[PDB]
Amino acid sequence: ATEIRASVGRMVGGIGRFYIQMCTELKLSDQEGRLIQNSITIERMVLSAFDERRNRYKDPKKTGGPIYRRRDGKWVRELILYDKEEIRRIWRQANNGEDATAGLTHMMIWHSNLNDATYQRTRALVRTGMDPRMCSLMQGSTLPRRSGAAGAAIKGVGTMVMELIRMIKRGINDRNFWRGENGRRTRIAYERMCNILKGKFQTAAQKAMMDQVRESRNPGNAEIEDLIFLARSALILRGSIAHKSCLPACVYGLAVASGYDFEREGYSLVGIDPFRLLQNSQVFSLIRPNENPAHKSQLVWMACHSAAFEDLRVSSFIRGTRVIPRGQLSTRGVQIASNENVEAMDSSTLELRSRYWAIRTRSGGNTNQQRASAGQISVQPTFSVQRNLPFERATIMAAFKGNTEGRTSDMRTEIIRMMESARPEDVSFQGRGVFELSDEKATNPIVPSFDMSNEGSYFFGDNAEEY
Amino acid sequence: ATEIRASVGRMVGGIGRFYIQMCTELKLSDQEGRLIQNSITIERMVLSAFDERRNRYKDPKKTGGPIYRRRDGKWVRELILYDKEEIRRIWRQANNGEDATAGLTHMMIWHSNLNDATYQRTRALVRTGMDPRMCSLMQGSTLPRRSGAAGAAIKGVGTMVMELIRMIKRGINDRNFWRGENGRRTRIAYERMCNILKGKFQTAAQKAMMDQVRESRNPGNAEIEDLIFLARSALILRGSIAHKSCLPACVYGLAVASGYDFEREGYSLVGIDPFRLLQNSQVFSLIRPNENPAHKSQLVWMACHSAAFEDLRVSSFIRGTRVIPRGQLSTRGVQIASNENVEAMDSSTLELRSRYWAIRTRSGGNTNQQRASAGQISVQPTFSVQRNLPFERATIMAAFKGNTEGRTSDMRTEIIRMMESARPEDVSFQGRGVFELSDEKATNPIVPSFDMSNEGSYFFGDNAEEY
Amino acid sequence: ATEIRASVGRMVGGIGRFYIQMCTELKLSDQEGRLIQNSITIERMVLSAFDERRNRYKDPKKTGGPIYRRRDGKWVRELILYDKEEIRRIWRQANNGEDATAGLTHMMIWHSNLNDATYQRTRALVRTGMDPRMCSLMQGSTLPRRSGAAGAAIKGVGTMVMELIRMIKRGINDRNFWRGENGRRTRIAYERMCNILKGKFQTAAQKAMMDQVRESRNPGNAEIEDLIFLARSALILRGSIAHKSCLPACVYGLAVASGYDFEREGYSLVGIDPFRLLQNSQVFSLIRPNENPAHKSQLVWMACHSAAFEDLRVSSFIRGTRVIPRGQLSTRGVQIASNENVEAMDSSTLELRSRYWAIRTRSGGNTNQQRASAGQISVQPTFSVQRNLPFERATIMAAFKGNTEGRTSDMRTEIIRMMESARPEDVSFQGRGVFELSDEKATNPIVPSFDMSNEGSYFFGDNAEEY
């Protein structure tokens, strides 16, 4: 109900209180509690304080991280160390005798999102033997293993497939590990992942084709090839994947400080609240000597809206400033590896405001054509009479396309068919528009007309017009 | 010789006498002996009276069926029961101390034919995992198992392939049944069917490709996929399948009553006699309240000439009235399931005459191109001299089409090549025309010009212009 | 250094002395020492005198062959017999206490070359199940087994692949012969051949694809299919294969007689010396009654420059007369089978001069495109806003081409991609030209302009304009 919304704010308020409470535990300056990198330090400290082999990506039961401080002049890094069980202690009292890890996960989503915005992860994509071409499909691949079910929501088709192929490989040529106890422990790990990916697919032929891949005990090369095929297909006939807007702990923090009652107001990760919130919020970042603060700003705003693989046009359109392609950006990662000191770096306010707001979908657009097409298509002569013998020249020759020696042959062909139908400008979401921020409900949807300025669409593509 | 023709009439006369003799055994009215549904009742009673596990599709050694009677008013159904050995008794005395089952089979052909005209058997085609697209190829699929060798003549390519795939399946994932005794009993069942289908194929590359499919003990997915490929191919490069004209027992019956001496005159199922015969013959049918007698007429005439998958143009052209597409017909099946009573139904004369007659082929048209094309096609530079390096851009790229990881790769490619060559209006049977019914021999062939009226070709296709 | 050149002449001079020394051992007329067929008799006598199961393609430790003699009138054949160890004896004394088989091999190269010029070896290409289409790739297939490493240099891609498939076959369905001792003796025979062929390939994707073929103990149908695919690909994206100019022993012979000091002057099989040499040399051949001496001349000149698969244009261009297609030639083989007597045949001077000379490459032209193309190519909607969803329609659909159920799928696709890029007139060797024979070094390269006369390119192709 609005149950769903009051329990979402429950857990966001969770973060807020926590962060705030934490912020004095380090006596961090007011101004320093807003600094993004100090926030990430903290977030990944709570997660570092709750895992063992999952969640968060010379050591006891402690956990530290670089913490920055502007002191009588420049910035400096004071990496610290805290007791997990001491941090564990807070979270709970800030969440009322519970931990309701839903909070924990929310954060570790934001991190991924942020990452999907930052790191063009081609190098890993080849090792799997799939195509670097496929960034758009790799959502939340930086997601830790065993990551929350509602975290598997985020993962894109490409993210998932990879992971599976990764097991098939450990299976095909490495010690046959569906052979007994583990044979079932890590066969179900597999069986379920296929359905989850099966779950995300739009067309039925794709789903129909995921089954064949799952019904193969001791699966191998044919199966891994099938999965890449399936992965490619997802570029057009696209997968329905979630997109949640998740902010740095500090935003939620200052929000709570300024007096927001999140359990009163409720929250949704797909609605207005995240935009509203970003509008009224200041968050600083450090910037490397030769970097562009504006571009840092873009990077984070993108991250904040899981926007990494969105048509740059719409992104720029909602944003109110041109959102720029990845290789043209004048920035590296938000986080600062301990090499570069911090004598060089200055800090800066990040520009995270938007002109419009829009609703985050869990969809993939449209993808279909015909129910089962049952027509006869050709002729069988009965009589000895001179005449041509008709046949559907085109639909017949298309039937032989993508044919294969395996049981996915005509399922592949079907995709190829359905794929060929499509065109780069079949409209989707027809009707649904953006919103003025005053418009709190959905008064006026604004559909945008896109013989516009940018004209270029992909964040991780290649040049043609610059900046 | 005309031996072949005098022994064909021997067995048709067979039917005629029988039917007649049978007709008084039920004292069926004169008018009632002509009714088609009463004829089918009888036909399938003789077959019901001769099988055990083949031929014909609360019970002793008997056999009955719905028999209809117009009584002092409307029609009514008087389903009966007879002793097989009593029916068995007649057939033989009507065939002179023999049964010469050639008769038996002839009938069970007509039934199939009739069925190929009536039932769009898509639902079954999917279960096999082949394409509903493929009606034209499904001739005599309604044919019972173990059906006569000269009944396997009728079967189309699609009918056959299905049947095989059906065994391969019972083989791949169901108890390995080529493993010993049955291992050979039902491996030869298989080995022979491939050759029979191999037999029907036109091109050599197809035949060449059937072999590879047969030479595989314990055959599976690759083989079943190969067979569908082969099945598709048969839509264009088409299979040579028989087409025999086979009438209801009653036609042959009244013919004999009216004094035809079939052994004197002889018969052929591919010549004039069937048309001649249909011309001079009346056969009534019952018709459901909201049905079109004309359309019933068409359905049966089609059935009577194995015309179900013929270009509607030629069919309409021979017929003398427009033969209409299947979904546009205002009728259901000829047979009446016992649900609908017969108080509603009236009967009607069926219009089975034709304007012209034509010769029934066992061919599939033309299909070929080149003997083995041996040319060099590219260049290997010997010298360091600046210049382009020639090559057959098109014939090379075509070579990579339909390539496969299996031993049918370039055999597939070859088909794909030969298939692509073809065009929906390569003329076939060049020269052979239709005939005026007076023209008893082959005086004047009439080749038809087909920028005509209908313009639409397939009986089981989809709309564009209606009725 | 010029070490490389002084040791090449060492071994050519080898041949020369030998031949000469041999020529008096038969007291062969001066005029008869120049006759080509008598030279081949001798060459294959030395090789016949040095092998057991390799090198050279009712008998003791002897070796003879048809030797021809013009006697007081016509020509006649005096087939002889010599002791291997007697011939063995000479070669060595003519090569100074060594045999330096490098000579032996040089000859057995010329023979192959000659053969590649003469015999359109389609009949064998089918038996392997590869395409007759593929002459251009079959260099030195007539090469004996175990033929010298620097003889494997000559072999083209097609020659090689065949040989492998030939083992795979003896492997797939014939007694599993990688199973133990031989299991490794003739598995390494295999492993090495893949690398040698791998070695010859231009693109990396091809090489990358040869590996997968090699990493398969007990390899079969999938592998043999992979190799043909690879073979086809070599028609466009062509293989780097050596081309050495190797003359009949007699040329080298008369050269030495006339006083050339080959160890003084040095030799190269890729430079000017072979042309220079051919210019100043007379060599006679016998000609069958209905044959064209000019065409015999062409055949041998082609053979002499490993030119059999060269663009006829360049060949004619260097040659100075039109080099004619194979089926249009008015000659059969150089060698005379003992059936046809020699009463009919006359002899003739062969026209082996050239207008220009050019440098023999070991290259295959150009073949490439892009380093790893890493771009994003499509979009994943984040927001519910009405708009089309962009994607690279063409580069995506091309990705599904040549897909396969095997681990070479996208390696195949990659080739298909790279192959499609190409065009029959991408120039290669850009800059490198021919040479006037006076021009001893590389003063003036002559790049030829080829809107010329012939316009037809392949030696073993099919008609369009004749002679």
UniProtKB/TrEMBL annotation, chains A, B, C:
Modifications made to the protein after synthesis: Late in virus-infected cells, may be cleaved from a 56-kDa protein to a 53-kDa protein by a cellular caspase. This cleavage might be a marker for the onset of apoptosis in infected cells or have a specific function in virus host interaction.
Keywords, sorted A to Z: Capsid protein, Helical capsid protein, Host nucleus, Host-virus interaction, Ribonucleoprotein, RNA-binding, Viral nucleoprotein, Viral penetration into host nucleus, Virion, Virus entry into host cell
Extent of motif Bipartite nuclear localization signal: 169-187
GO molecular function: RNA binding; structural molecule activity
Any matching Pfam family: Flu_NP
Annotated Gene Ontology cellular component terms: helical viral capsid; host cell; host cell nucleus; ribonucleoprotein complex; viral nucleocapsid
Subunit structure: Homomultimerizes to form the nucleocapsid. May bind host exportin-1/XPO1. Binds to viral genomic RNA. Protein-RNA contacts are mediated by a combination of electrostatic interactions between positively charged residues and the phosphate backbone and planar interactions between aromatic side chains and bases.
Homology family: Belongs to the influenza viruses nucleoprotein family.
Known role: Encapsidates the negative strand viral RNA, protecting it from nucleases. The encapsidated genomic RNA is termed the ribonucleoprotein (RNP) and serves as template for transcription and replication. The RNP needs to be localized in the host nucleus to start an infectious cycle, but is too large to diffuse through the nuclear pore complex. NP comprises at least 2 nuclear localization signals that are responsible for the active RNP import into the nucleus through cellular importin alpha/beta pathway.
Record protein name field: Nucleoprotein
